Structure 1
Protein backbone atom coordinates (compact mmCIF):
# COMPACT_ATOMS: atom_id res chain seq x y z
CA UNK A 1 0.00 0.00 0.00
CA UNK A 2 3.00 2.24 0.69
CA UNK A 3 3.51 2.52 -3.08
CA UNK A 4 0.76 5.19 -3.09
CA UNK A 5 3.32 7.67 -1.71
CA UNK A 6 5.75 7.19 -4.63
CA UNK A 7 6.20 10.46 -6.51
CA UNK A 8 4.65 12.47 -3.66
CA UNK A 9 6.51 14.90 -1.40
CA UNK A 10 6.29 14.32 2.39
CA UNK A 11 6.02 18.07 3.04
CA UNK A 12 3.07 18.35 0.65
CA UNK A 13 1.33 15.39 2.30
CA UNK A 14 1.89 16.66 5.86
CA UNK A 15 0.91 20.21 4.83
CA UNK A 16 -2.32 18.93 3.26
CA UNK A 17 -3.11 16.55 6.13
CA UNK A 18 -2.25 19.25 8.66
CA UNK A 19 -4.57 21.75 6.98
CA UNK A 20 -7.36 19.16 6.89
CA UNK A 21 -6.99 18.24 10.57
CA UNK A 22 -6.91 21.86 11.77
CA UNK A 23 -10.01 22.66 9.71
CA UNK A 24 -11.90 19.51 10.71
CA UNK A 25 -11.06 19.87 14.42
CA UNK A 26 -12.14 23.52 14.59
CA UNK A 27 -15.37 22.83 12.67
CA UNK A 28 -16.13 19.92 15.01
CA UNK A 29 -15.49 21.88 18.21
CA UNK A 30 -17.53 24.90 17.12
CA UNK A 31 -20.35 22.55 16.11
CA UNK A 32 -20.03 20.62 19.38
CA UNK A 33 -20.07 23.75 21.56
CA UNK A 34 -23.43 24.60 20.01
CA UNK A 35 -25.03 21.21 20.65
CA UNK A 36 -23.66 20.25 24.08
CA UNK A 37 -24.35 23.59 25.86
CA UNK A 38 -20.68 23.78 26.91
CA UNK A 39 -18.86 26.12 27.76
CA UNK A 40 -22.26 27.81 28.23
CA UNK A 41 -22.76 25.84 31.46
CA UNK A 42 -19.18 26.68 32.50
CA UNK A 43 -19.85 30.39 31.96
CA UNK A 44 -23.11 30.21 33.92
CA UNK A 45 -21.36 28.57 36.89
CA UNK A 46 -18.96 31.49 37.40
CA UNK A 47 -21.11 34.37 36.06
CA UNK A 48 -21.92 37.23 38.44
CA UNK A 49 -25.61 37.30 39.53
Structure 2
Protein backbone atom coordinates (compact mmCIF):
# COMPACT_ATOMS: atom_id res chain seq x y z
CA UNK A 1 0.00 0.00 0.00
CA UNK A 2 3.04 2.23 0.52
CA UNK A 3 3.45 2.39 -3.25
CA UNK A 4 0.74 5.09 -3.37
CA UNK A 5 3.18 7.59 -1.84
CA UNK A 6 5.87 7.23 -4.51
CA UNK A 7 5.75 10.21 -6.85
CA UNK A 8 4.31 12.39 -4.05
CA UNK A 9 6.12 14.86 -1.76
CA UNK A 10 6.01 14.35 2.06
CA UNK A 11 5.79 18.06 2.90
CA UNK A 12 2.89 18.65 0.50
CA UNK A 13 1.07 15.58 1.85
CA UNK A 14 1.63 16.58 5.48
CA UNK A 15 0.51 20.15 4.71
CA UNK A 16 -2.71 18.89 3.11
CA UNK A 17 -3.45 16.42 5.91
CA UNK A 18 -2.47 18.95 8.58
CA UNK A 19 -4.72 21.65 7.13
CA UNK A 20 -7.53 19.08 6.96
CA UNK A 21 -7.14 18.09 10.62
CA UNK A 22 -7.04 21.72 11.78
CA UNK A 23 -10.24 22.49 9.89
CA UNK A 24 -12.12 19.31 10.81
CA UNK A 25 -11.26 19.60 14.53
CA UNK A 26 -12.31 23.26 14.65
CA UNK A 27 -15.59 22.56 12.82
CA UNK A 28 -16.27 19.59 15.12
CA UNK A 29 -15.61 21.55 18.33
CA UNK A 30 -17.71 24.57 17.36
CA UNK A 31 -20.51 22.23 16.28
CA UNK A 32 -20.18 20.23 19.52
CA UNK A 33 -20.28 23.36 21.71
CA UNK A 34 -23.65 24.17 20.14
CA UNK A 35 -25.16 20.74 20.73
CA UNK A 36 -23.78 19.71 24.14
CA UNK A 37 -24.52 23.02 25.97
CA UNK A 38 -20.87 23.17 27.07
CA UNK A 39 -19.11 25.57 27.90
CA UNK A 40 -22.48 27.30 28.44
CA UNK A 41 -23.00 25.29 31.64
CA UNK A 42 -19.44 26.17 32.69
CA UNK A 43 -20.14 29.86 32.09
CA UNK A 44 -23.38 29.73 34.12
CA UNK A 45 -21.62 27.93 36.99
CA UNK A 46 -19.21 30.81 37.75
CA UNK A 47 -21.40 33.68 36.49
CA UNK A 48 -22.26 36.57 38.81
CA UNK A 49 -25.54 35.94 40.73
The two structures have a TM-score, normalised by structure 1, of: 0.99
Unaligned runs of 5+ in 2: none
CA distance in 2, matches of 1:44, 1:4: 51
Size of the alignment, in residue pairs? 49
Unaligned runs of 5+ in 1: none
Q: How far does the alpha carbon of each residue in 1:13-49 deviate from its partner, in whole angstroms, 9 at most, with x for none?
A: 0000000000000000000000000000000000001
Extract structure 1 runs of 4+ deviating beyond 3 A.
Answer: none
